Symmetry: C3
Subunit: 321 residues, 3 copies
Amino acid sequence: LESKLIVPKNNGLKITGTFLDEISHDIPHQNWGEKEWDLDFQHMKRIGIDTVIMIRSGYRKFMTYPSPYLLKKGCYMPSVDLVDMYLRLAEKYNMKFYFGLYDSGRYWDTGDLSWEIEDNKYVIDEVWKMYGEKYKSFGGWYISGEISRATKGAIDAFRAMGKQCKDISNGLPTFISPWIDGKKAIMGTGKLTREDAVSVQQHEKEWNEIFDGIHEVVDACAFQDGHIDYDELDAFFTVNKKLADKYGMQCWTNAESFDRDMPIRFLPIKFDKLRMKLEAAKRAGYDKAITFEFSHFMSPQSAYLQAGHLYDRYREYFEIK
Amino acid sequence: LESKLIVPKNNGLKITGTFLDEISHDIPHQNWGEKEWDLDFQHMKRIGIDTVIMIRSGYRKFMTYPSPYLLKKGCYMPSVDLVDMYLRLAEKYNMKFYFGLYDSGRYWDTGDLSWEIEDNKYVIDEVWKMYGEKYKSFGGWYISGEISRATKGAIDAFRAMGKQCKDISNGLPTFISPWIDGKKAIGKLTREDAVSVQQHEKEWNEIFDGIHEVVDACAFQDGHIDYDELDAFFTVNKKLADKYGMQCWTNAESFDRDMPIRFLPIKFDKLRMKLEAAKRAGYDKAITFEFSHFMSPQSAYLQAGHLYDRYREYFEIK
Amino acid sequence: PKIKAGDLESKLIVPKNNGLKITGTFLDEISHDIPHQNWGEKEWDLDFQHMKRIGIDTVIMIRSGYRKFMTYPSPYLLKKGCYMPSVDLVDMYLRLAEKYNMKFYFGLYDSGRYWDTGDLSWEIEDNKYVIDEVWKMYGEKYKSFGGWYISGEISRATKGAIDAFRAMGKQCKDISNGLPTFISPWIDGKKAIMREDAVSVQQHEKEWNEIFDGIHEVVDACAFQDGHIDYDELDAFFTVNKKLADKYGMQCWTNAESFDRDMPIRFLPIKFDKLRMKLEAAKRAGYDKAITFEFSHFMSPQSAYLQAGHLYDRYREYFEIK
Ligand code: NA
C-alpha cells in the first residue's frame, strides 16, 4: 500500500546537505561508531545528499579531533578522530565536507560573539595543515557562531573568521546558519510562545546591516526555518532571498527536520510541515536546502523510528527510488 | 518464559476503542503512510478493538481532509486525505469510525467553548455529504471540545454540535471525552487543590442535565486523578451517567502522566488498575488515548510493543 | 543500504581499558522517573544475559516500594493500603540472579515522607516491618540474596539522615547476620538543579566527614552518583570521596550514571566518551567498584532507547569484551 497524495509530488526544494551533529549542544548522542556512520552516509547518498557539515569542531571542553591547541587549553581528548572519519566517509561517497568552527561557550555566556575569534585563529590554521591540505573532500567552512538579531561583535567575528578561512584555504566556500527571532524562539524565556516576535521589517533592517558587513567573506546564508509559523514562510523567505540577492550571497534554507511544536525537545518533524517549508523555499527561488539533521531526524538508522518513516514519506513525495 | 502473575487475569474492562491522534495537539508524528496504518489496524483487530475515533478533523490551520470550507479560511492543504483512509481501513477491518469535530484554537485561547460551534456547522455539513453518505464505516461523532469543569459556553456548544450531528446523520451516536480536574491536571508533576468528588459531581450534574439528549456517552480521561481515587470518581461518573441515561465509558490513557518525559507508554500495572476499577464500577466500554503510539507493536516507543504483550498476557488474547 | 559485515570499528586515539569496569547495575524498580519498559520475565532473563556478557556480577533493586507501589506482595504494605503488583519482582530477580550467578541487593522501601519533608528519619518505621518480612520471605530462602541498598538519597547534611542510616543499616545487618549494605547519595554540584552555587569540595568533605563518622559501622560502601558535577571536577571530588572512605574504613564505589544529564530530554543514554571519562577518573582515584544507574534502559541492547545498544557496543570495544 501507499497513501494517495492529494498535493503535487516533487514540488519543493530537495535536501542536498545535512549537518553532522558533532559536538551537539542539545541532541542526545546515538553512540555510533564508524560502521554506523558509513551506513548513514549510504542512506544520505540514496536521497542525493552531496554535502555534509560537521556543526562545531568543539564545544567548550569537548572536541571532535585531537587538537594540539585545544588540548593545551585543557579540553578533553576524544576517543575517536571524527574529522578524519567524516573526511574519509565524504571522500568514499563523493560528498563535500564543511568544517564547523569551534564554539568556546563564551559567546553563549555573554552575548558577545567576539569571544569566539581568538580560539578559531588557532583552530583554523591547525585544521588546514592537519586535514585541509591532506584530504580531497575538505570543501568548505561553516561559521558556527549562531545569531538571530543584531549582536555585539557578530559582524566583526564573521568578518575575521570568514577572512582567515578563505585566506588559508585559497577561497573555499563559507556559510552561516542563523535563526529567525520568531514566535517559537522561546529559548531562555520560560514561556511556550513569544508575543514579541520580530517583525519582517526589523529583521530586514538588522540583517541588511549584517550582510553589508560580511558578504565579502561569507558566501551563503542558511537561515534555520523553524522559529516562525508555517503561514509566515513566504514573508520571511522573500526578505531573506532579497537580502542575499542584494549582497551577492547564495540563499540557502536550513530545513529543520525535527518538530519545534511538541513538548519533547526534539523528535522528528511531521512530514507535511517539512514539505511546506521546502515548497516555500522553492517558491522563493532558493539555491539549496540543507537540514539539521539527517542522522537523528531522517535516517532509517536513527533511534527515533519516526525518522525512518519520515525518510519513506520524503522519498515518496520526491519520487526517489 | 512468562511472568507468574499474582493477581487474577482477565479481571478488568477490555479496551475496545482507540483514538487516532490526528490532528495531534502534542504527540510527535510517527510519519506513517497507508501501509503502516493498515498494519496498525491489524494489530488493533487482534486485541478486539472495534471502534476508531479520529480525535480532531482539524486543529487551527492543520486539517485531516481537503475541506473546501477550511481551505477558504486559509488552512493548509494536507498531503493525504486521512478521513478517506481511515474510513476505508475501518471498513476493511469491520470497525466503526467516529469523526472528531474541528478544533479552531479559539476555545483554547479564550476559555469560551462557544467559539467552536461556527466552523463545525460547515465541517459537519460538508463531511456528512463528502463521507457520511458514502462510507459504510462512518459510525459516529466525537465532540472534541475538551473540558474538566463548568466552562463558559460549553453546555450550549455541546448541545448545538450534538444536535447538528444527530440531525444530519439520522441519529448516529455522539460522545465527549472530558478530563477530571485532579492532582495531575497541571508547575511540578502534581498539586494540592484538586477538585473534590462533591464539586465535580455538582458541575457535571449540570452539564449532563444540559447535554444528555444529544450526547450519548461520556468517556472521562482517567489519568489526572491518583490510582487510589479511581473508585470514588468512577462511582460518581457512573451514577451521573445512569441519572441521565447516558453510556459510561472510560478513556483509559495508555501513556504515563507520572514521568518527566511527556509522554511515553504507561506502566502496564497502572493501566490494569484503571481497567479493573472501570469493571468494578460497571462501565459500558473502555477506549484509549492512544493505541498507535502507546500500545502498538509498530510504535516508535518500543515500550508500547512490550505493553501490548503484557496486555495480551493479562487478557489471555492469542 | 546494508550495514557492512565485519569489524569496521573506529580507530581509538585514547588508551583502551583505562577506566574501572561496571560490575553492578541498579534494577529500576520502583522507578521515580524513568518510563517503564513493560518487560516480563522473558525480557528480564534476556537482559540478565546481556549483563553477564559484560561482567556484571551484582544487581540492585533500587527501592522495594515507592509510596503506594511495591515490587513484591508485602503483607505490611498491603495492610497500609498500597497496591498489589501483578508480578513478584523480588522473587523474579532473586531467581534470575541465582541463574546467572549474581549477588542481589534489596533496596529499602521509600514512603515518600522524606521527599515531602526533608527529614529522612520518617523512612525508618515502615522499613522496620519491610526488613523483617523480607528476610523471612526471601533472605532465608534464596541463595542470591546478598546485600541491602539503603535507598534514602541525600547530597548534603540532612535532618535525621545519620540516625536513619544507622537504624536501617543496623537492622539489615542484624537480621541477615552481616550482609553488606551501601548508600548511593549524590554530589550537590552544578547539575543538581531538580547553577552557580554548587557545593565546594571543602564543604562537601566537611559534611560527609560527619555523615561517614556516624554511619560507617553499619554502612559498608558509599557509591556517589557521579553525574551532578562537571567532567573537569571528577578528580577533585573523587579524591575527597576516596580519602573519606579510607578514613572510615568503607569501600569506595562509583555510581556511574549511563544516562545524559546535559540534554533537554530527561533522560536518554549518555555519550560514551562522557561515561568513559567518569570511569577513567574512578580508576585514577583507586575506586573499588563501579555500578551504574541503569543498565536495562541506558546500556542494554534490549532497551527502547536504541542509543543504549550502541553504547553497549562502544563500551565493549573500549574494554575489549567479546
Ligand atoms: Na526523627
